[PDB]
Symmetry: C2
Subunit: 304 residues, 2 copies
């Protein structure tokens, strides 16, 4: 029993982290096969970041200006190219620790593990969600850029995120591993405000199912609702609309607990309208939305 | 910026996890040098667990009855001994991935990372604290026994916990790596009730300092207090007493923020007496107590 905010084991990703230095900027790179992926803003001074022209800045850079260090050993850069907002540094050595991997672009509400790195060295691992406004709420200090987000399916690492930016509001923005930002953000130090950080309704419902499985049941009530009725209340509380697709995804948790998805929606509706009244659910005073239905099934079944 | 519940990178520990089978019981082992450490209840049927005599049960066990598998390769057991509540299986091969390590016995309030494992295979990593009642609130299903808790200091893994037991209340009990239970618990399926789960005051204070560093300041007030006055309120709210030792440990966070420890105690006192009034601190509606002062400094400075 028990239900924890749980990250994927980080070993396979730790084996991929390198240090990338260009001039006075040091950040992290991801070494897969004979390519090191890093934020293209490695080429920028903090002055450059105010209004960078990346193509023009890159003209002044050669392979030998990109210093790539894997532990205490230097990698030889034999080529470089810009793909969207990432640099791809071709090196002369294939990473011997390259895991099976994919690059995936996740949707808002999807969770992933972040391995926070400084100077190519892992400091910690935590679980995140892609927010409905395409930010993440991470823990990233100067030097953490190029830290990556990932899911693991048995032995295949799916890389979904690379850290680039902190907004003036202290929330985080980055790219997939093809260098495309999540949401409308750009790698420029400018007025970038996030939209509404809505709650990921399907994730809250999953986590209420996790609570029932684990013996926290006080919030179950005698009511049901409809998707349309629930969605009026969701809208009022800045929750994401619930779709039949979400109801379908929750079906296995519904089956296991014998609680119809719409009954659990009616419990959530009362919690929104009534509050927690100083009670907790799985040790939380607010409704947790950074567990997907897949996460709840995985953790409640002990997948490795 | 940002502050996350962060586990140590798990790679060094992943390299140590093995499967241990005795008869029909499979659980996890920790392979360091040529010794595999596992809960001695690997020798028990669920029937045995009601009233086990471990010495008597062990007489019927030989080296060849302990099946140790590291990935898909079998290890040869050349000896076995019982130390307190753990078995030490001597194997003929030193773990080639053995990290620098220590065995430490932590105090209540100390945090650590758990690598949850099933069948010798890591499923996830999360952060825990040793509760003041010597339980932990983990996420452990059948098969998770022998999963370990650890801290890392640069490249040295300090192992502090091995998972043994779930109490009927769904909280967790285990041993240090010398096989001594934390608290009064035993490896027997019997009435074992935990004492009061008090809040780790020094950890809450650390986390309020983390909040200030990260821009969450609404709870700072115009008041101060004394240790004796604060401690009357702590006692009323089932918080651990604060000692001058705790004040000393918080000194660096006091220095960095310019908030005297006793001023932060006065903020905590008002939060206890007034509640959160539906507000959050670092995304939490309750006061977090699973960050040590060392954890806050580490995460706020980006140690690797």
């Amino acid at each position: 029993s028990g239900f924890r905010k749980m990250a994927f084991p980080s070993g396979k990703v730790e084996g991929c982290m390198v240090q990338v230095t260009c001039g006075t900027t040091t950040l992290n790179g991801l070494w897969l096969d004979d390519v090191v992926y890093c934020p293209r803003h490695v080429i920028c001074t903090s002055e450059d970041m105010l209004n960078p022209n990346y193509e023009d800045l890159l003209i002044r850079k050669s392979n030998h200006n990109f210093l790539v260090q894997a532990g205490n050993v230097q990698l030889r850069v034999i080529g470089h190219s810009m793909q969207n907002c990432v640099l791809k540094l071709k090196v002369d050595t294939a990473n011997p620790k390259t895991p099976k991997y994919k690059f995936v672009r996740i949707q808002p509400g999807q969770t992933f593990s972040v391995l926070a790195c400084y100077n190519g060295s892992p400091s910690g691992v935590y679980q995140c969600a892609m927010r409905p406004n395409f930010t993440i709420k991470g823990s990233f200090l100067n030097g953490s850029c190029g830290s990556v987000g990932f899911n693991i399916d048995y032995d295949c690492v799916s890389f979904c995120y690379m850290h680039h930016m902190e907004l003036p509001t202290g929330v985080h923005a980055g790219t997939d591993l093809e260098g495309n930002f999540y949401g409308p953000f750009v790698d420029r130090q400018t007025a970038q405000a996030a939209g509404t950080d809505t709650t990921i309704t399907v994730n809250v419902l999953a986590w209420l199912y996790a609570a029932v499985i684990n013996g926290d049941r006080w919030f179950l009530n005698r009511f049901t609702t409809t998707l349309n009725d629930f969605n009026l209340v969701a809208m009022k509380y800045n929750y994401e609309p619930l779709t039949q697709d979400h109801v379908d995804i929750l079906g296995p948790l519904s089956a296991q607990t014998g609680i119809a998805v719409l009954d659990m929606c009616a419990s959530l509706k009362e919690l929104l309208q009534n509050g927690m009244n100083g009670r907790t659910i799985l040790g939380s005073a607010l409704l947790e939305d950074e567990f997907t239905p897949f996460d709840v099934v995985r953790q409640c079944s002990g997948v490795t």
